[PDB]
């Protein structure tokens, strides 16, 4: 379908693996907000959107309706499970690289299915935990997903970085390199 | 590998000419196969695969379900578009233009919104349309975009950028 | 405010 703007006013996700769920709203491929299903709060991903209020109970009840529908298809479809996909990974910077200036590294993991992935950052072989953030599972028309992970840093000539992606569709963890 | 059973539900709205043309499509997806769909141009549920036939057949037999689903074009899509007119659609982020040499030339147009943009290479007030390879539009994910335009040069070069958020196009010079 | 679309339960 061709249109000027596309909005997914309801990206509902529920999977049987470790009962996981997700509720997000999207507009033109960007995430407006997501509901923390554990803390029962709406988290806005754009500051201008914080003026609105979205009842997190709706997301909880809606995911429960998906849980009921999924349990019906598990019986009817004679237990046809999801097929694993081979994800593509790319690492790049948000702004041009100048030594000493604050910047952010962006690791894009595309063609994700099932929506179960581990994304970590490595600096010269060692793991990095501080300054790491990511989005939710952003939806595609292929009915797969893609997730983006961020890492704030001060780039120097002595530190290289890696993005470590773990997925069931990979025979081994995928590492993508980046250097100033 | 552990087995997984995935279920998705996408309540989508498509807008063209603003509110002149609005279309609603609900999608019920088992793993990656859409099984049941409600298209606003059809007016009732349609089973995309045989697996969703009992669901679509029963839902079309409830007059109150079809009534709520048919009115969703005005109550959900057109209603939320009023909020988009003063938030996401208004968003204007001016791009930062930078030229770096690494016989090539890389005009880095970073952090802008919306996605509408045009980058042109000039060589002595002459648009160079050959030797220009442009990367696809890169979605940063935080509601900003970036794009890099390459130039195959042999040695003033200026990078021309047009974006809705600008009052006058930005030009950056090299050598 | 943001108005969403609920999913109908299967019979």
């Amino acid at each position, epitope marked *: 379908i061709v249109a000027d703007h596309v909005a997914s006013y309801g990206v509902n996700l529920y999977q049987s693996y470790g009962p996981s769920g997700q509720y997000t709203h999207e507009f033109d491929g960007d995430e407006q907000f997501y509901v923390d299903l554990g803390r029962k709060e709406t988290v806005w991903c754009l500051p201008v959107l914080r003026q609105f209020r979205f009842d997190p109970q*709706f997301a909880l009840t809606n995911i429960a309706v998906l*849980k*009921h529908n999924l349990n019906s298809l598990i019986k009817r479809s004679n237990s046809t499970a999801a097929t694993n996909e081979v994800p593509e990974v790319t690492v790049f910077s948000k702004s041009p690289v100048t030594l000493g200036q604050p910047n952010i590294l962006i690791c894009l993991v595309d063609n994700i299915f099932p929506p179960v992935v581990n994304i970590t950052w490595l600096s010269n072989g060692h793991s990095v935990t501080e300054g790491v953030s990511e989005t939710s599972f952003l939806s595609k028309s292929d009915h797969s997903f893609f997730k983006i992970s961020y890492l704030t840093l001060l780039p120097s000539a002595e530190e290289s970085y890696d993005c470590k992606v773990e997925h069931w569709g990979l025979d081994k963890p995928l590492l993508k390199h980046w250097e100033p | 590998s552990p087995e997984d059973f995935v279920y998705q539900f996408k309540g989508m709205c498509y807008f063209t000419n603003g509110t002149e043309r609005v279309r609603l499509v609900s999608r019920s997806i088992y793993n990656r196969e859409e099984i049941v769909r409600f298209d606003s141009d059809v007016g009732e549920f349609r089973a995309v695969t045989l697996l969703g036939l009992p669901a679509a057949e029963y839902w079309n037999s409830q007059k*109150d379900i079809l*009534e709520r689903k048919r009115a969703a074009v005005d*109550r959900v899509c057109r209603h939320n578009y009023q909020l988009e007119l003063r938030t996401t659609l208004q968003r204007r982020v001016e791009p930062t233009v930078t030229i770096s040499p690494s016989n090539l030339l890389v005009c880095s147009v970073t952090d802008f919104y919306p996605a509408q943009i045009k980058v042109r290479w000039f060589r002595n007030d002459q648009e160079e349309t050959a030797g220009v390879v442009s990367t696809p539009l890169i979605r940063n994910g935080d509601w900003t975009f970036q794009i890099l335009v390459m130039l195959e040069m042999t040695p003033v070069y200026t990078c021309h950028v047009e974006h809705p958020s600008l009052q006058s196009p930005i030009t950056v010079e090299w050598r | 405010q943001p108005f*969403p679309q*609920p999913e109908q339960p299967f019979p």
Partner: T-cell receptor, first 110, second 112 residues
Framework: MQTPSNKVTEKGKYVELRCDPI?????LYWYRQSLGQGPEFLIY????????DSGLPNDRFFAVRPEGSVSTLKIQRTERGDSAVYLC???????????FGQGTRLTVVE | MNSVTQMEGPVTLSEEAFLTINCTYT??????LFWYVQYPGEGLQLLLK?????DGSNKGFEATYRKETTSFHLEKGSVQVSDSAVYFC????????????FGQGTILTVHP
């Protein structure tokens, strides 16, 4: 739909209310009607899992529907404020015809 | 806010009298309005409903969905003795998954 018409309970003890919905109805709703009031929502089941628990007043209230048929509402450490009629309704989802039960009238005695 | 405020106090009428039970609502979006009757000794049962604007009629009872006044007033031109019961005005929104927001009841007693 509901198994006991009336039940008597002593303060500080637990009670269990049972509701057997109509065969095939996947949605089940629990309500509470105090004296001189209208029914008020408690919990909504969609199949075997709970979908909305916002109506439960406190942690002493808890419901379950194993098998996605019969549902049990258990009130622990009952007080005289828990005395009301506990209604039960079933349907096939929203915008489908809902059928209410006769209700169980609970009376907590000191 | 999803509230239903209807008439209170026992309404006392005679045979073949005119009945009116006011019901006003306040809801954020587009709601469906209901009327429930609870006869003595029995449970709740749906009397009539309405789903759009300017839209129910069962057993001679009549109610019109009015968005201009946010009303769903019940009316009957000739009440019977068998109408003696409690009447509940209800409401359910498009994002409430069929949950019903009731009001306090209105007791009706028809003298023969």
């Amino acid at each position: 739909m509901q198994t006991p018409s009336n039940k008597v309970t002593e303060k500080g003890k637990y009670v269990e209310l049972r509701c057997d919905p109509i065969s095939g109805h996947t949605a089940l709703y629990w309500y509470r009607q105090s004296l001189g009031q209208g029914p008020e929502f408690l919990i909504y089941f969609q199949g075997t899992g709970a979908a909305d628990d916002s109506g439960l007043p406190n942690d002493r209230f808890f419901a379950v529907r194993p098998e996605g048929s019969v549902s049990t509402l258990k009130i622990q450490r009952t007080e005289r404020g828990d005395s009301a009629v506990y209604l039960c309704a079933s349907s096939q989802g929203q915008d489908t015809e809902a059928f209410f039960g006769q209700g169980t009238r609970l009376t907590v005695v000191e | 806010m999803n509230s239903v405020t209807q008439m209170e106090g026992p309404v006392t009428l005679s045979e073949e009298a005119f009945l009116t039970i006011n019901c006003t609502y306040t809801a954020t979006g587009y709601p469906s309005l209901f009327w429930y009757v609870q006869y003595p000794g029995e449970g709740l049962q749906l009397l009539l409903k309405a789903t759009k604007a300017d839209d129910g009629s069962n057993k001679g009872f009549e109610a019109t969905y009015r968005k201009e006044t946010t009303s769903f007033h019940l009316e009957k031109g000739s009440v019977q003795v068998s109408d003696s019961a409690v009447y509940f005005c209800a409401l359910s929104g498009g994002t409430s998954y069929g949950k019903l927001t009731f009001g306090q009841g209105t007791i009706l007693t028809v003298h023969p």
